[PDB]
Amino acid sequence: PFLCESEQLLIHPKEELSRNNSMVWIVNTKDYKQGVRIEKCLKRQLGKPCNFCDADTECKQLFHYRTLVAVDKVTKKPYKEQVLLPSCCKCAKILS
Amino acid sequence: KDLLCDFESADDCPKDCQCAMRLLDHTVIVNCSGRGLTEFPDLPIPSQLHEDFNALEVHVENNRLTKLPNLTKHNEITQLYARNNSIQNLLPHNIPSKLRIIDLSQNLLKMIDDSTLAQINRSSHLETIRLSQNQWLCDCPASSFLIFVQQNSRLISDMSAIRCHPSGKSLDSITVNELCF
Amino acid sequence: KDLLCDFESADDCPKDCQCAMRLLDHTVIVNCSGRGLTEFPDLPIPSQLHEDFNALEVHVENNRLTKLPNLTKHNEITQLYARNNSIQNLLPHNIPSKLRIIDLSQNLLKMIDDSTLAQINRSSHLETIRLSQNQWLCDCPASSFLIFVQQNSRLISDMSAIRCHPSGKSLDSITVNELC
Numbered sequence: 001p002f003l004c005e006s007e008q009l010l011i012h013p014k015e016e017l018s019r020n021n022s023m024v025w026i027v028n029t030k031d032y033k034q035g036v037r038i039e040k041c042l043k044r045q046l047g048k049p050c051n052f053c054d055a056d057t058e059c060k061q062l063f064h065y066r067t068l069v070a071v072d073k074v075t076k077k078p079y080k081e082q083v084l085l086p087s088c089c090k091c092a093k094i095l096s
Numbered sequence: 097k098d099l100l101c102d103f104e105s106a107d108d109c110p111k112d113c114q115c116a117m118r119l120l121d122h123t124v125i126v127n128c129s130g131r132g133l134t135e136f137p138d139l140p141i142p143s144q145l146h147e148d149f150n151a152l153e154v155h156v157e158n159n160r161l162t163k164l165p166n167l168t169k170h171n172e173i174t175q176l177y178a179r180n181n182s183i184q185n186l187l188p189h190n191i192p193s194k195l196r197i198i199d200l201s202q203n204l205l206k207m208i209d210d211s212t213l214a215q216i217n218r219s220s221h222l223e224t225i226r227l228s229q230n231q232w233l234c235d236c237p238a239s240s241f242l243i244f245v246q247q248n249s250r251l252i253s254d255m256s257a258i259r260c261h262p263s264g265k266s267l268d269s270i271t272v273n274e275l276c277f
Numbered sequence: 278k279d280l281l282c283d284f285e286s287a288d289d290c291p292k293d294c295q296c297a298m299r300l301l302d303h304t305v306i307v308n309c310s311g312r313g314l315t316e317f318p319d320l321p322i323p324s325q326l327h328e329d330f331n332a333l334e335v336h337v338e339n340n341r342l343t344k345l346p347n348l349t350k351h352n353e354i355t356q357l358y359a360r361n362n363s364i365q366n367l368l369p370h371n372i373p374s375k376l377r378i379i380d381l382s383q384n385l386l387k388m389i390d391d392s393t394l395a396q397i398n399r400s401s402h403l404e405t406i407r408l409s410q411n412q413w414l415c416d417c418p419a420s421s422f423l424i425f426v427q428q429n430s431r432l433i434s435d436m437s438a439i440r441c442h443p444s445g446k447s448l449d450s451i452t453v454n455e456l457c
């Protein structure tokens with residue numbers, strides 16, 4: 001078991017829509033999704049004090065940043081992105 | 097039942113038919129009408145439209161059709177109207193077993209073959225039928241047809257609408273003996 | 278619907294038969310298990326001052342080789358069930374007016390009366406009848422009965438199957454009045 005009620009969630013990539021096509025289309029692309037995986041606490045929706053450890057605690061949600069940096073192809077200024085994703089939900093002891 | 101959409105951007109549609117496709121029933125629609133083609137139009141197999149919508153509707157109406165060239169090869173058809181067409185007699189292959197509804201309203205029909213009506217014995221799907229407003233031949237050969245009609249009353253929409261060709265009357269009034277004196 | 282709890286202890290049926298009233302069905306089934314016996318005297322109808330008890334029906338359908346004489350002609354009897362007996366006559370006085378359904382399954386169809394047909398009137402009440410395994414023969418007045426049944430083809434629910442010994446096939450198929 002774990003101190004916090006953390007649940008895996010899959011997020012589908014945003015689907016490009018061919019609204020130009022008034023005709024129906026295969027849902028096969030809708031059928032399979034590569035997706036990404038995240039984590040969140042539903043512990044009272046992430047409110048539990050991590051009960052079975054009695055020390056003064058409250059469950060926190062923790063994030064991670066991915067840094068992809070590439071100098072532009074047109075040799076413009078270097079482009080750096082830091083996408084943030086909810087990665088873990090962890091319990092921390094607190095004062096009084 | 098009305099949410100329609102374009103026919104998969106395919107050119108497979110016949111010329112004057114302005115067909116379409118309907119998801120709800122998975123029925124590729126073909127709406128040849130107003131004498132679009134005097135000959136029966138070619139059947140676009142459901143292999144198109146992502147090979148989906150196995151059932152196929154055909155909506156021929158107000159057409160000069162005189163000879164149903166429908167074949168057992170075309171078992172994708174689910175429905176048929178043929179309303180207001182000049183058809184004297186029908187072939188046994190002309191009606192497919194897979195067909196669920198046929199109407200042929202207000203047509204020229206007057207005859208029948210028991211071989212044609214071999215599928216009066218149940219088909220894969222119920223054949224809900226409503227043929228009417230025609231002049232149908234009247235004799236002991238037609239008396240067996242009347243018996244067929246009487247037995248399968250549920251499959252038919254009405255027995256008042258059918259009329260004896262020389263003298264329009266509801267076919268229920270006749271026992272085969274009356275038509276055989 | 279429930280039965281024998283919706284039905285009280287005032288058993289009109291003899292103990293040989295499990296009569297019971299159904300609330301929604303508005304009916305009581307004799308539900309007798311005795312075949313070849315006397316006609317079950319389910320004639321009493323505890324109306325219970327409700328619509329739930331105004332109809333009647335029989336179950337064993339083989340209760341007697343001679344049709345049950347319903348001389349009462351009670352409005353209770355609506356659906357009548359007879360099978361696996363050699364019934365050989367029908368009294369129109371037995372047939373009730375409020376009666377809606379009857380059968381002659383596994384019974385013999387000799388030259389029944391025309392007052393049978395006149396007795397029932399489609400305008401007064403809809404009539405549905407089951408004819409099958411009617412091995413008894415055909416004749417000219419029976420040809421009249423067959424032609425009448427063909428005329429009331431809707432009323433004759435089993436007009437498709439009804440056959441007699443001389444016919445060797447469904448009766449309405451051959452209706453040459455020259456042959457009895």
Ligand SMILES: *[C@@H]1O[C@H](CO)[C@@H](O[C@@H]2O[C@H](CO)[C@@H](O[C@@H]3O[C@H](CO)[C@@H](O)[C@H](O)[C@@H]3O)[C@H](O)[C@H]2NC(C)=O)[C@H](O)[C@H]1NC(C)=O
Nearest residue numbers: 100112113114116125126127128129130131155156157158
């Ligand atoms: C297949 O083709 C036929 C060919 O006529 C289509 O029939 C169309 O039916 C509609 C529905 O009634 C008609 O629209 C109506 O027109 C009158 C005329 O003024 C108007 O007052 C009504 O408000 C209504 O708009 C239409 O005229 C008629 N013809 C055509 C060419 O569309 C039929 O709808 C087509 N599709 C199917 C599934 O049958």
Ligand SMILES: *[C@@H]1O[C@H](CO)[C@@H](O[C@@H]2O[C@H](CO)[C@@H](O)[C@H](O)[C@H]2NC(C)=O)[C@H](O)[C@H]1NC(C)=O
Nearest residue numbers: 280293294295296306307308309310311336337
């Ligand atoms: C009361 O009627 C019901 C149904 O009308 C009878 O239920 C029968 O139960 C047997 C037991 O297997 C089945 O084989 C039959 O098909 C059922 N229906 C009929 C019409 O018999 C029930 O047996 C009846 N009870 C009594 C005491 O007669």
Ligand SMILES: *[C@@H]1O[C@H](CO)[C@@H](O)[C@H](O)[C@H]1NC(C)=O
Nearest residue numbers: 312336337338339359360361
């Ligand atoms: C069928 O025949 C048997 C005779 O063995 C009889 O007991 C039974 O009640 C009959 N069934 C009906 C529905 O009449």
